[PDB]
């Protein structure tokens, strides 16, 4: 069971992207499906559901040239659950998940303009990244692992654990309020998309 | 006061229109330059009017003349009648901006919904992805079919279009519920404003 190792990917609300590695192309489609074309001709396509829990695999007949769109499916097709997926495709599923993990860290879920900064909560929940692009060129990025400060000069620092330099704290004190605010809205609005179950309320731009 | 209510320019993006010149400043203050020779600056909340004269003077710049010492402040109530029709010009203008100024853009699978800033009872435009368009108002609803066949109903079932009108009504209910939820939170937080908002 792939489960014993990794976890199902999440691509919900991800804008489209196509990147060519050497071994193959990876995509996020308008459907928020994830496509891995193994490879210059495509010999194998994996199409993972936006949830992670479904993997569709189709081949050609013959020895599928490269393209904008991925190749429309064939009758040589299969479907697996995350649990049923054969070992053979596991490292492919993990390429797709690493990639998607990359995108979500940089995919805004909420953009909020305070008097003093642009605040960005990312899609890499739980514990998503949080960027604060101060309008006077200060930058504070918060991560589960750590916090990066960049000063108006370019002095850039990490704090995996505080006294900063006091003046840093005015900015960090703000960053924190912004995080508390974007985390309260995300909860409120998320509550609403539960109660209504209509169309996604994310991402949002505020102010 | 007896007549017009104080204007509201909260969250309105800047604009200078020439006719007198009227402006909404980056401060959400409303400026009327009469022609210059007189400047009225109404507060974003409508209740304070600052009036200053040149020391004519003031050639028509693209920005309002910086402040002078021939200056007055009034309350909405204190405002002398000499200035009432100037205030009312400013109020009509702002009513016009607000009706076309969006507070909420929501992207449904079928359409773009826009609740405007002309509360209470704000306009609600539904720009369907297929080219259908519905515009709700307190007075009436305009329907534009894909053809162009406009139809300003004022009170009715015409069939088929009811599929779209039902969607439009859902979107309104959804946008009117988000406004309430995010409005509660803004009441409880004291942070920077939460509107406008784009969702989707």
Residue numbers in the entry:
A (entry chain A): 586 to 624, 631 to 654, 657 to 754, 759 to 804
B (entry chain B): 588 to 606, 609 to 624, 633 to 652, 655 to 754, 760 to 804
Task: Provide passages from the article that reported this PDB entry.
A serendipitously generated CPB CP_v1 mutant containing a C-terminal random 32-mer extension also interacted with ANS in a similar fashion. To gain insight into how the CP mutations alter the physicochemical properties of CPB, we determined the crystal structures of both CPB CP and CPB CP_v1. While extensive efforts to obtain a high-resolution CPB CP structure yielded only a 3.7 Å overall resolution, the structure of CPB CP_v1 was solved at 2.64 Å. No densities for the C-terminal 32-mer extension of CPB CP_v1 were detected. An individual alignment of PB1 or PB2 of the CPB CP_v1 structure with the respective domain of CPB CP showed a Cα root-mean-square deviation value equal to 0.6970 or 0.7679 Å, respectively, well within the acceptable range of two superimposable structure models. Remarkably, CPB CP_v1 exhibited a substantially reduced level of twisting (119°), thus forming a greatly flattened PB2–PB2 axis. Since twisting of the β-sheet occurs as a cumulative outcome of an inherent property of the peptide backbone in each strand, the CP mutations near the PB2 base might have generated a long-distance effect along the PB2–PB2 axis, yielding largely disordered PB2-tip residues (see below). Examination of the four CP mutant residues (S698E, S700E, T704E, and T707D) revealed that each was engaged in additional interactions not found in the apo-CPB. While E698 appeared to reinforce its interaction with Q694, both E700 and E704 were involved in rigidifying the CPB CP structure by forming extra intra-subunit interactions with K600 and K711, respectively. D707 seemed to stiffen the CPB architecture by engaging in two interlocking interactions—a salt bridge with intra-subunit H771 and the other H-bonding with inter-subunit A796—thus securing the PB2 β7–β8 of one subunit to the CPB α2 backbone of the other subunit.
